[PDB]
Amino acid sequence: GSDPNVDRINLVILGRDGLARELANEIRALCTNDDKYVIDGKMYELSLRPIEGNVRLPVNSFQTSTFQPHGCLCLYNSKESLSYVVESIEKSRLINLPLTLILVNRTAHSLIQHGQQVASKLQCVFLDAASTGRNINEKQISLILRGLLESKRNLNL
Ligand code: NA
Ligand code: NA
Ligand code: NA
């Protein structure tokens, strides 16, 4: 269970073709051995749920009996991986869940254009981390996590 003295972030990471595993691995490299992530000198419990396959399947559901999601980090770098994000979100709709759509490193014009329309439709923030492996800068990870903590307090997640 969650330590009542340490704030918990339950983060879904959504991305096919190994995108979710890769970002989850990066984030865990930044964590303590008991999965704490430090922000502004403060410890947070960080639970990660990387998803790459069909979210219809129980094993791939956003929410489980011990995991209530607080946000979802959506990753893509291609037509197919963008399509996977839309399919997964619209199908598992989790609707007021804070979402972040991130374009990562692997056409460039169309991926940005479509990403922005998808983010508009899903009502979420769009970040271009491709210019910035298929990783994301750790400072950007911390910004997203800070944002989730405030959302968590506003939406009572
Ligand atoms: Na807690
Ligand atoms: Na976890
Ligand atoms: Na996990």
mmCIF file of C-alpha atoms and ligand atoms in Angstrom:
data_model
loop_
_atom_site.group_PDB
_atom_site.id
_atom_site.type_symbol
_atom_site.label_atom_id
_atom_site.label_comp_id
_atom_site.label_asym_id
_atom_site.label_seq_id
_atom_site.Cartn_x
_atom_site.Cartn_y
_atom_site.Cartn_z
ATOM 1 C CA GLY A 1 0.000 0.000 0.000
ATOM 2 C CA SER A 2 0.911 3.675 -0.264
ATOM 3 C CA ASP A 3 2.886 5.263 2.599
ATOM 4 C CA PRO A 4 0.552 7.915 3.983
ATOM 5 C CA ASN A 5 3.621 10.087 4.709
ATOM 6 C CA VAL A 6 4.943 9.989 1.112
ATOM 7 C CA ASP A 7 2.940 11.095 -1.934
ATOM 8 C CA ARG A 8 2.310 8.452 -4.579
ATOM 9 C CA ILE A 9 2.221 8.862 -8.356
ATOM 10 C CA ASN A 10 0.594 6.023 -10.319
ATOM 11 C CA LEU A 11 1.774 6.532 -13.896
ATOM 12 C CA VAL A 12 0.617 4.595 -16.939
ATOM 13 C CA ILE A 13 3.155 4.611 -19.740
ATOM 14 C CA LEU A 14 1.540 3.894 -23.089
ATOM 15 C CA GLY A 15 3.663 3.166 -26.165
ATOM 16 C CA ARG A 16 4.003 0.255 -28.581
ATOM 17 C CA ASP A 17 7.117 -1.273 -30.174
ATOM 18 C CA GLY A 18 9.109 -1.056 -26.939
ATOM 19 C CA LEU A 19 8.486 2.657 -26.336
ATOM 20 C CA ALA A 20 6.804 2.137 -22.964
ATOM 21 C CA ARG A 21 9.434 -0.306 -21.714
ATOM 22 C CA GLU A 22 12.253 2.010 -22.783
ATOM 23 C CA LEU A 23 10.835 5.066 -20.970
ATOM 24 C CA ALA A 24 9.960 2.936 -17.925
ATOM 25 C CA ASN A 25 13.578 1.672 -17.852
ATOM 26 C CA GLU A 26 14.873 5.261 -18.065
ATOM 27 C CA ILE A 27 12.591 6.401 -15.256
ATOM 28 C CA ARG A 28 13.644 3.460 -13.039
ATOM 29 C CA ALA A 29 17.297 4.355 -13.626
ATOM 30 C CA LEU A 30 16.375 7.645 -11.933
ATOM 31 C CA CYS A 31 14.642 5.946 -8.973
ATOM 32 C CA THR A 32 15.892 4.637 -5.646
ATOM 33 C CA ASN A 33 15.855 0.881 -5.034
ATOM 34 C CA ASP A 34 12.436 1.167 -3.359
ATOM 35 C CA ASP A 35 11.020 3.047 -6.393
ATOM 36 C CA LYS A 36 11.141 6.561 -4.949
ATOM 37 C CA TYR A 37 11.681 9.501 -7.301
ATOM 38 C CA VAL A 38 13.094 12.720 -5.858
ATOM 39 C CA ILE A 39 11.664 16.083 -6.940
ATOM 40 C CA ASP A 40 12.615 19.418 -5.367
ATOM 41 C CA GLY A 41 14.417 17.470 -2.642
ATOM 42 C CA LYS A 42 11.218 15.567 -1.836
ATOM 43 C CA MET A 43 10.635 11.807 -2.089
ATOM 44 C CA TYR A 44 7.703 10.507 -4.132
ATOM 45 C CA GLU A 45 6.562 6.901 -4.522
ATOM 46 C CA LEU A 46 6.444 6.182 -8.231
ATOM 47 C CA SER A 47 4.436 3.229 -9.520
ATOM 48 C CA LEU A 48 4.829 2.542 -13.256
ATOM 49 C CA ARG A 49 2.535 0.580 -15.538
ATOM 50 C CA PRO A 50 4.080 0.344 -19.017
ATOM 51 C CA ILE A 51 1.599 -0.858 -21.665
ATOM 52 C CA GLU A 52 2.466 -1.863 -25.245
ATOM 53 C CA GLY A 53 -0.292 -4.263 -26.297
ATOM 54 C CA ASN A 54 -4.061 -4.469 -26.619
ATOM 55 C CA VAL A 55 -5.645 -2.664 -23.654
ATOM 56 C CA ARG A 56 -8.780 -4.783 -24.114
ATOM 57 C CA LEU A 57 -6.851 -7.584 -22.430
ATOM 58 C CA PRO A 58 -7.091 -7.673 -18.601
ATOM 59 C CA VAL A 59 -3.303 -7.917 -18.277
ATOM 60 C CA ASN A 60 -3.072 -4.600 -20.177
ATOM 61 C CA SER A 61 -5.849 -2.626 -18.464
ATOM 62 C CA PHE A 62 -5.044 0.890 -17.221
ATOM 63 C CA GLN A 63 -6.544 0.164 -13.828
ATOM 64 C CA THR A 64 -6.036 -2.929 -11.693
ATOM 65 C CA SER A 65 -7.109 -3.872 -8.159
ATOM 66 C CA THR A 66 -3.911 -2.380 -6.693
ATOM 67 C CA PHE A 67 -3.288 0.373 -9.258
ATOM 68 C CA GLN A 68 -5.455 3.460 -9.732
ATOM 69 C CA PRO A 69 -3.841 5.569 -12.479
ATOM 70 C CA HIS A 70 -3.104 9.264 -11.852
ATOM 71 C CA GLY A 71 -1.931 10.102 -15.330
ATOM 72 C CA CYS A 72 -0.859 8.604 -18.601
ATOM 73 C CA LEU A 73 2.284 9.265 -20.548
ATOM 74 C CA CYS A 74 1.539 8.516 -24.235
ATOM 75 C CA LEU A 75 4.506 7.960 -26.539
ATOM 76 C CA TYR A 76 4.782 7.755 -30.337
ATOM 77 C CA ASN A 77 7.317 8.120 -33.156
ATOM 78 C CA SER A 78 5.411 6.826 -36.143
ATOM 79 C CA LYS A 79 1.985 6.563 -37.782
ATOM 80 C CA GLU A 80 1.394 3.122 -36.232
ATOM 81 C CA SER A 81 2.480 4.104 -32.728
ATOM 82 C CA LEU A 82 0.260 7.242 -32.836
ATOM 83 C CA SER A 83 -2.627 5.045 -33.962
ATOM 84 C CA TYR A 84 -1.983 2.727 -31.012
ATOM 85 C CA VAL A 85 -2.282 5.641 -28.585
ATOM 86 C CA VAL A 86 -5.628 6.822 -30.018
ATOM 87 C CA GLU A 87 -7.043 3.299 -30.140
ATOM 88 C CA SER A 88 -5.924 2.619 -26.580
ATOM 89 C CA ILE A 89 -7.256 5.849 -25.042
ATOM 90 C CA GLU A 90 -10.615 5.959 -26.881
ATOM 91 C CA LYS A 91 -11.215 2.283 -26.201
ATOM 92 C CA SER A 92 -10.361 2.325 -22.490
ATOM 93 C CA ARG A 93 -12.615 5.385 -22.238
ATOM 94 C CA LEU A 94 -9.672 7.423 -17.480
ATOM 95 C CA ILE A 95 -11.406 10.276 -19.282
ATOM 96 C CA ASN A 96 -10.438 13.107 -16.909
ATOM 97 C CA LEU A 97 -7.103 11.321 -16.445
ATOM 98 C CA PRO A 98 -4.269 13.824 -17.122
ATOM 99 C CA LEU A 99 -2.628 12.790 -20.405
ATOM 100 C CA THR A 100 0.646 13.798 -21.966
ATOM 101 C CA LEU A 101 1.346 13.044 -25.611
ATOM 102 C CA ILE A 102 5.021 12.866 -26.489
ATOM 103 C CA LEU A 103 6.708 12.680 -29.860
ATOM 104 C CA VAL A 104 10.036 10.903 -29.338
ATOM 105 C CA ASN A 105 13.016 10.007 -31.532
ATOM 106 C CA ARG A 106 12.824 7.084 -33.952
ATOM 107 C CA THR A 107 7.303 12.212 -42.226
ATOM 108 C CA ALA A 108 8.461 14.566 -39.461
ATOM 109 C CA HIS A 109 5.954 17.204 -40.591
ATOM 110 C CA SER A 110 2.997 14.824 -40.672
ATOM 111 C CA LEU A 111 3.841 13.264 -37.264
ATOM 112 C CA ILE A 112 3.881 16.701 -35.647
ATOM 113 C CA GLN A 113 0.689 17.806 -37.419
ATOM 114 C CA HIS A 114 -1.203 14.633 -36.555
ATOM 115 C CA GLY A 115 0.177 14.636 -33.005
ATOM 116 C CA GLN A 116 -1.183 18.138 -32.451
ATOM 117 C CA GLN A 117 -4.641 17.209 -33.771
ATOM 118 C CA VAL A 118 -4.711 14.065 -31.606
ATOM 119 C CA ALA A 119 -3.676 16.114 -28.564
ATOM 120 C CA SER A 120 -6.421 18.615 -29.391
ATOM 121 C CA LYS A 121 -8.963 15.818 -29.695
ATOM 122 C CA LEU A 122 -7.810 14.068 -26.515
ATOM 123 C CA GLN A 123 -7.603 17.449 -24.758
ATOM 124 C CA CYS A 124 -4.065 16.906 -23.590
ATOM 125 C CA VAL A 125 -0.640 18.491 -23.735
ATOM 126 C CA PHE A 126 1.599 17.783 -26.720
ATOM 127 C CA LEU A 127 5.372 17.679 -26.237
ATOM 128 C CA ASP A 128 7.999 17.397 -28.976
ATOM 129 C CA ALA A 129 10.882 15.510 -27.338
ATOM 130 C CA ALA A 130 12.248 14.273 -30.663
ATOM 131 C CA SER A 131 14.364 17.367 -31.243
ATOM 132 C CA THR A 132 15.204 17.427 -27.521
ATOM 133 C CA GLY A 133 17.905 6.786 -28.009
ATOM 134 C CA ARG A 134 14.154 7.292 -27.820
ATOM 135 C CA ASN A 135 14.522 8.755 -24.311
ATOM 136 C CA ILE A 136 13.149 11.998 -22.809
ATOM 137 C CA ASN A 137 15.216 14.473 -20.741
ATOM 138 C CA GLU A 138 14.932 13.820 -16.986
ATOM 139 C CA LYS A 139 13.919 17.457 -16.358
ATOM 140 C CA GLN A 140 10.953 16.994 -18.686
ATOM 141 C CA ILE A 141 10.013 13.824 -16.802
ATOM 142 C CA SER A 142 10.089 15.843 -13.524
ATOM 143 C CA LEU A 143 7.921 18.604 -15.015
ATOM 144 C CA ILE A 144 5.295 16.074 -16.105
ATOM 145 C CA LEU A 145 5.342 14.431 -12.671
ATOM 146 C CA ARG A 146 5.005 17.793 -10.875
ATOM 147 C CA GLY A 147 2.017 18.545 -13.098
ATOM 148 C CA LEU A 148 0.403 15.240 -12.186
ATOM 149 C CA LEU A 149 0.677 15.920 -8.447
ATOM 150 C CA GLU A 150 -1.244 19.178 -8.822
ATOM 151 C CA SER A 151 -3.835 17.484 -11.071
ATOM 152 C CA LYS A 152 -4.145 14.703 -8.530
ATOM 153 C CA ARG A 153 -5.051 17.319 -5.916
ATOM 154 C CA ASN A 154 -7.541 19.118 -8.192
ATOM 155 C CA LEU A 155 -9.304 16.071 -9.592
ATOM 156 C CA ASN A 156 -9.253 14.084 -6.318
ATOM 157 C CA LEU A 157 -7.676 11.041 -7.975
HETATM 158 NA NA NA B 1 1.007 8.092 -0.028
HETATM 159 NA NA NA B 2 5.325 -0.091 -10.319
HETATM 160 NA NA NA B 3 5.372 -1.426 -12.200
#
